[PDB]
Each structure stands twice: as structure tokens, then as C-alpha cells.
Amino acid sequence: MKHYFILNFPQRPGALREFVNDVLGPQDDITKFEYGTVIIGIQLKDHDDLIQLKQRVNHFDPSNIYINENKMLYSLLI
Amino acid sequence: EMKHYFILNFPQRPGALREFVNDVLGPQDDITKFEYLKSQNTGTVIIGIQLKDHDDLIQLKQRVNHFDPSNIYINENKMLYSLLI
Amino acid sequence: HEMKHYFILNFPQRPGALREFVNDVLGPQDDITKFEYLKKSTGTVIIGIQLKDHDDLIQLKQRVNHFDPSNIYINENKMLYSLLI
Amino acid sequence: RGSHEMKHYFILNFPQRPGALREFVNDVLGPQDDITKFEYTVIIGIQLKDHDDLIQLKQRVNHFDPSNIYINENKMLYSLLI
């Protein structure tokens, strides 16, 4: 239910405003935002919405890295 | 000053970052720094905000005060500005 | 011009653990170039080391292994080196 | 807390020259003084075994970094950073 990513936020201004209002859903909530590599944890109301979120993250940052797929990154970062 | 810096004890209310971006922040305003200084995910964060216009600073401070009543404006303390920025 | 070695260690919470790493684990000719945390609840740290004698690297990894058996040599993993350096 | 506080915190500008941490661990610190914190300008915490040893530690810290800031004096700096 808590899914973690690693992104390189664009230096383009208003990117986080674009991320909150477009990349994420209304019921989705950011649970982590630690440092331009940024670690971010997002909680999902339903697991059936994860795949579409992954696609939107790839549009925002093609350099995105899903943490939960690599166990070592999960143990080290989370 | 077009870049302003604050100290906030981020509320545990869900969607706080969305609340800060859409309500505490202006549509033409951007955040330039988001760095914790405390540790856990529950922590004290140092935030930097850039305003489109300086006239919106007084009203911005009030929005930050409603978000975290114990917030601290750094730009008006030379000691904290020199140490944290 | 120079080569450095970065490690991930679950640094023991015992007091004086850094003196042990500097004196017992690290050779007198070797120096530390990076000490940065990755998480807390203050466990994981990235420690970068510059050795004057590359031939002593094998012995270094042993002393790091005895210090923290959870040692991870960052330089081996491709994804870890690019992400963390 | 005239002689009963054993955890003391400082803000130092570490020289980026080699062996600085070895110089700080051996030359600056005392034999019974143990490090308790080191986070990035770096905030450092040391626990003494004897409060009388504090004077010498502060003197040696001033030599290492004249720009050092003993945090415990400022209750504000103590609250925000610890």
C-alpha cells in the first residue's frame, strides 16, 4: 500500500505543483520527501491504482526508479 | 528578497504537502529548498519559497502560520540565516 | 589522479564506534572523504575512503567486515555507484 | 547543569584537508570522550565522562575550528537542532 520511488525532479519551475496536481491522485498522499535525486513514499488507497501511477511517474521522470522492486534499495533507503 | 525561507514542524494531517503546495503556496510561487534538519520521516523541515511578487509575502506568512502555528521565518534572523542558508 | 572506495555500513550505535573505525579499521595512511547518512530508525552511512596503497584494499574489506558484517561495497554494484556517487 | 551535563554539541566547519576526522578523533577528543552525533558545516555531539574535561575539549575545538559554535548555550539552537 506504501510504494516508494526515486526521481530526478526537473529544474523546470512549478514541477512539484505539477507532480501533486497531475502525477498523483486526489486520495494519494506523499509520505516521504527526502533528498537532484529525491526519495518519495506514496500511500495508495487501493493497490489497483499502482500500475497507472507508475506510468504517470515515467512521464514526469523517465529516470524514475521504483524502490519496492529491488529489495536492497528497500532495505537501504526505507 | 525574492527567496524566503521558513522552518516548519510539518503536520501529520494526510496530504500536508498537497495542502502546502495548493493552499499555502501561490500559483505563481515556487519552492526552492526542502531539506530536513533533525531523525525520522516525522521531522522539522527547512523550506525556501520564491514569490512572483513581493507584495504577497505578508499574506504568505499568515498562510504558513495557519499551516504550522509554530513556524519560524528565517530571513528576519541573521543568526539563523547565516547558519542554515 | 586518485581513487576512492565507498562503503555502506550499519554503523553500531555504541559510543566511540567512530574512533574504532578511524583507528582500528582504517590504516594510518588512509583517509575518509565522505560520511553521509542514508536513513534513521542513524543506521546506514556511506563512508568513502582513499587508500595510498591499493594492495591493502583486501585487508580493508576484512576489517570493515569484522566491524560491520552488513558491509556493502558500493563500488561493485553498478546501480549503487551511479546513484550514490 | 554546572557539572552534571555530559552531552555537549558543537557546529564546526570541517577543513576539507585529508585526515581531518583522524585529527579530530585523536587530537581533539579526550580518551574518555565518545562521539554521539555527526551530521551535516557539521553538527557533532560528544559525551564526556568527566565534566572537568569539558574545558580542554572546548579549547581544542577552538584551535581546530575558530568558527565553532557551542550549541548548548543557546536554548533555541539546542531545541531546533537536537
Swiss-Prot record, chain A:
Reported function: Catalyzes the anaerobic formation of alpha-ketobutyrate and ammonia from threonine in a two-step reaction. The first step involved a dehydration of threonine and a production of enamine intermediates (aminocrotonate), which tautomerizes to its imine form (iminobutyrate). Both intermediates are unstable and short-lived. The second step is the nonenzymatic hydrolysis of the enamine/imine intermediates to form 2-ketobutyrate and free ammonia. In the low water environment of the cell, the second step is accelerated by RidA.
Protein name according to UniProt: L-threonine dehydratase biosynthetic IlvA
Subunit structure: Homotetramer.
Family statement drawn from the similarity comment of this UniProt entry: Belongs to the serine/threonine dehydratase family.
Gene: ilvA
Domain ACT-like: 3-69
Residues represented out of the complete protein: 337 to 422 of 422
Swiss-Prot record, chain C:
Record's signal peptide: none
UniProt gene name: ilvA
Organism per entry: Staphylococcus aureus (strain USA300)
Subunit structure and binding partners: Homotetramer.
Lineage: Bacteria, Bacillati, Bacillota, Bacilli, Bacillales
Function: Catalyzes the anaerobic formation of alpha-ketobutyrate and ammonia from threonine in a two-step reaction. The first step involved a dehydration of threonine and a production of enamine intermediates (aminocrotonate), which tautomerizes to its imine form (iminobutyrate). Both intermediates are unstable and short-lived. The second step is the nonenzymatic hydrolysis of the enamine/imine intermediates to form 2-ketobutyrate and free ammonia. In the low water environment of the cell, the second step is accelerated by RidA.
Annotated ranges, domain ACT-like: 5-76
Family: Belongs to the serine/threonine dehydratase family.
The name this protein goes by in its record: L-threonine dehydratase biosynthetic IlvA
